[PDB]
């Protein structure tokens, strides 16, 4: 029925060749994660910040606490090697399984075993496979907790003294905090869950998520869908694909904003400064320089009449001036020591800016996530010399693009699933065209 | 006979002159809210401090604008990405100075258009159609999401979203070219290929069908009276069109299958506009068009300019001039 | 604003004259049938 270019649709009702397709494709994933880490480590120079080197995987490993010490300095590269090799090796085993089940294995599973066999329309079996995978994911989330609490901790950009690897002993359990984030506006100064800003809340939320996932896994093993759910959904392989494409799209969008705004679970030590951070850093940089020359930065009126260096947010908080007035919700470890209760504190500004904060401000203003597709750093009008594009832009853009096509894929397969379920996905039956049996509109 | 079932039956009825549906239940109110606010503000809103520098910009007809120069002006940079509903303002006067209508209009609109896309899926199901017209519309919807929501998210402020105005649109695209160089960005180039190409294939397909109409009328009457709505037979001769177009190029560059032809007509512009929408959306996070500034140098090290450097001179002129009172520091980092 | 005084009548006739032409043609079409 299907053409070569829709050829994978021929696997819909071949559980054995479809198991192979999935497992072989999971091998490609593990393979990429493996090769790419080794490629990054082969290219890694430790005296250069990670974000001057096009690294996206090594920062993920560092953030988990491996390889790094105080301030994000890399101290031991062997955990990066290990993570790549193990992934790499494990892909051969998935690849082996994958081509075995796609080529030589039982083409359908149901004849060989009633446990592994499935029919898409079996609501109990489908909720049972969903149950198993929910548990697996619950376990995965708890592995993050175990690492944070019993196997070294995690990197904490907020730890006093430049940031450091820190073990997490009082995870947040209070559901008001954890589920409070889920209820926060996604808008400015609020951030929905992208505002999470300390590792205690990260680890606590993962305990919850692992329990909820294990409980739901068990729930879905032990139940079958209720009749309101049975009548609400399409129950077909393509329909389940469409639901998951919807979900991954949503998640891709979320991850986009997370790597763009969050500097806790994407430490700027590793990923480079966020857009807001770098903009705030510039205002800081010139406040520092001009004050050193004698400028009274609190009393300097800028051309518009707003403060040149310092003004008020719309709720009163003292903030950086210029266009970065838009970025006053930014919070970061190099800047919070200057915040008092009314926003930025003028006596702290006048007396207590340290050199490390001057360096960090200068470093981040000159490493903002602006650059060209061919990796010329900076604003579009800058000349060639600096080969830099922030990992934050590479990860934000790439995952925006993927998220968008999966929403398109969600629409594609959802509408097709609906039409196939009612039986007109192949077109209109000339002998029974529904419009010809309706009254006309006028 | 159950009351709710009756309501569910009118909502989803295919006998309503305009289909409502469940998506329509969100679409109707949200689009009326956005439309009514837009019309009122385009005529009568007072000046808006778009860049947060207390430099209000007059957008409406009553404050000295014409149709071409008028706009509903984006909300203030002081607000950034903060949510500014009416009830968060001390007074409607405050809300107006600070740009609150722009937020009301664009959020209702994006919602309502999203539902517009759902509505297209939904009526197709009720009529027994195939489902994908809404995938076609997702190209323009994505493009609207990019200029009104995604680009403001990446840059940190709805004050850098596209104005709801004709000259405001131009301001938006000029400043975009200086800060991103969209012209040198491949996803815009596919957009141009998508839109030029779609206009081309529009004209071809229209000219090829018109060329091959079967004679059904006299010289005194519109050829159009030779088609009767709902007739079973085709009204042109696709073999005559294929025989013409195959010879104008060569045989295998011309379609003989009407289904492939029309799919191709759907796919080309939809895909090119997907890309251009994704270009705006990725330049939202500053992954900019190619930079060849000073890429050719002579044997001593002199810069040998290229057309790319002349582009850069223009881009520089837009950069140094835009929002001329809004920058205090040397780099326009957002 | 200091707009061109004849913009108004230019606009009024630009609307009125072609529109009226179409209305004449439509109405005498409808009363043939």
């Amino acid at each position: 029925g299907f053409a070569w270019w829709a050829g994978n649709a021929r696997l819909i009702n071949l559980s054995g060749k479809l198991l192979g397709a999935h497992v072989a494709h999971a091998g490609l994933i593990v393979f990429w994660a493996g090769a790419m880490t080794l490629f990054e480590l082969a290219h890694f120079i430790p005296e250069k910040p990670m974000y001057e080197q096009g690294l996206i995987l090594i920062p993920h490993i560092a953030t988990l606490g491996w390889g790094v010490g105080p301030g994000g300095e890399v101290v031991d590269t062997f955990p990066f090697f290990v993570v790549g090799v193990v992934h790499l090796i494990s892909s051969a085993v998935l690849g082996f399984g994958g081509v075995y089940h796609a080529i030589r294995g039982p083409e359908t599973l149901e004849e060989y075993s009633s446990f592994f066999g499935y029919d898409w329309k079996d609501k109990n079996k489908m909720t049972t496979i969903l149950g198993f995978h929910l548990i697996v994911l619950g376990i995965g989330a708890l592995l993050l907790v175990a690492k944070a609490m019993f196997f070294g901790g995690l990197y904490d950009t907020w730890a006093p003294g430049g940031g450091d690897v820190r073990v997490i002993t009082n995870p947040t359990l209070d559901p008001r905090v954890i589920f409070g984030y889920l209820l926060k506006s996604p808008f400015g100064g609020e951030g929905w869950i992208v505002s999470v800003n300390n590792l205690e809340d990260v680890v606590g939320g993962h305990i919850w998520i692992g329990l909820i996932c294990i409980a739901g896994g068990i729930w879905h093993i032990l139940t079958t869908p209720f009749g309101w759910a049975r009548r609400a959904f399409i129950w077909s392989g393509e329909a389940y694909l469409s639901y998951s494409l919807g979900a991954l799209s949503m998640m891709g969008f979320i991850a986009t904003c997370f790597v763009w705004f969050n500097n806790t679970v994407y430490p700027s030590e590793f990923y480079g400064p966020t857009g807001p951070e770098a903009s705030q850093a510039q205002a800081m940089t010139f406040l520092i320089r001009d004050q050193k020359l004698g400028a009274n930065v609190g009393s300097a009126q800028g051309p518009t009449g707003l403060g040149k260096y310092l003004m008020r947010s719309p709720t009163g908080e003292i903030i950086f001036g210029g266009e970065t007035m838009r970025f006053w919700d930014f919070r970061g470890p190099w800047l919070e020591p200057l915040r008092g209760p009314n926003g930025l504190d003028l006596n702290k500004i006048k007396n207590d800016i340290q050199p490390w904060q001057e360096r960090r401000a200068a470093e981040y203003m000159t490493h903002a996530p602006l650059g060209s597709l061919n990796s010329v750093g900076g604003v579009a009008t800058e000349i060639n010399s600096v080969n830099f594009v922030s990992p934050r832009s590479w990860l934000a853009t790439s995952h925006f693009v993927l998220a968008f096509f999966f929403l398109v894929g969600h629409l594609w397969h959802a509408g097709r699933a609906r039409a196939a379920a009612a039986g007109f996905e192949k077109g209109i039956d000339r002998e029974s065209e529904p419009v010809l049996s309706m009254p006309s509109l006028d | 006979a159950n009351l709710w079932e009756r309501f569910c039956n009118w909502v989803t009825s295919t006998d309503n002159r305009l289909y409502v549906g469940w998506f329509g239940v969100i679409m109707i109110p949200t689009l009326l809210a956005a439309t009514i606010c837009f019309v009122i503000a385009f005529i009568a809103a007072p000046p808006v401090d778009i860049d947060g520098i207390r430099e209000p910009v007059s957008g409406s007809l009553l404050y000295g604008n014409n149709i071409i120069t008028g706009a509903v002006v984006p909300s203030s940079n002081a607000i950034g990405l903060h949510f500014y509903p009416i009830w968060e303002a001390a007074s409607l006067d405050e809300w107006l100075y600070n740009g609150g209508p722009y937020q009301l209009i664009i959020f209702h609109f994006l919602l309502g258009a999203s539902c517009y896309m759902g509505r297209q899926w939904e009526l197709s199901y009720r009529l027994g159609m195939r489902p994908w017209i809404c995938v076609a519309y997702s190209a323009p919807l994505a493009s609207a999401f990019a200029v009104f929501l995604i680009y403001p998210i990446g840059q940190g402020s709805f004050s850098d979203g596209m104005p709801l105005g004709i000259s405001g649109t131009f301001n938006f695209m000029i400043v975009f070219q200086a800060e991103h160089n969209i012209l040198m960005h491949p996803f815009h180039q596919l957009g141009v290929a998508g839109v030029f190409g779609g206009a081309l294939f529009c004209a071809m397909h229209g000219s090829l069908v018109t060329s091959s109409l079967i004679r059904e009328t006299t010289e005194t009457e519109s050829a159009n009276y030779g088609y009767k709505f709902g007739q079973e037979e085709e009204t042109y001769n696709i073999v005559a069109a294929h025989g013409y177009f195959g010879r104008l190029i060569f045989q295998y560059a011309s379609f003989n299958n009407s289904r492939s032809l029309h799919f191709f007509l759907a796919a080309w512009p939809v895909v090119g506009v997907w890309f251009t929408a994704l270009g705006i959306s990725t330049m939202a996070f500053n992954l900019n068009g190619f930079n060849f500034n000073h890429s050719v140098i002579d044997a001593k090290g002199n810069v040998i300019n290229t057309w790319a450097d002349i582009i850069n001179r223009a881009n520089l002129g837009m950069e140094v001039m835009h929002e001329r009172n809004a920058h205090n520091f040397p780099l326009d980092l957002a | 604003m200091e707009v061109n005084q004849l913009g108004l009548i230019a606009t009024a006739l630009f609307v009125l004259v072609p529109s009226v032409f179409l209305i004449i043609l439509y109405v005498q079409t409808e009363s043939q049938q």
């Binding site: 509109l441 | 002159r17 305009l18 149709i67 709505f229 | 913009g7 108004l8 606009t11 609307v15």
Partner: peptide, 30 residues
């Protein structure tokens, strides 16, 4: 006078939409 002209033309276009949708030539099969 320019404002009234713009809003007048705009309002005529809306009226026209109303007539074009609800008082169209009904399409009839053959």
């Amino acid at each position: 006078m320019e404002t009234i002209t713009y809003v007048f033309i705009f309002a005529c276009i809306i009226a026209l939409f109303f007539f074009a949708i609800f008082f169209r030539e009904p399409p009839r099969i053959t």
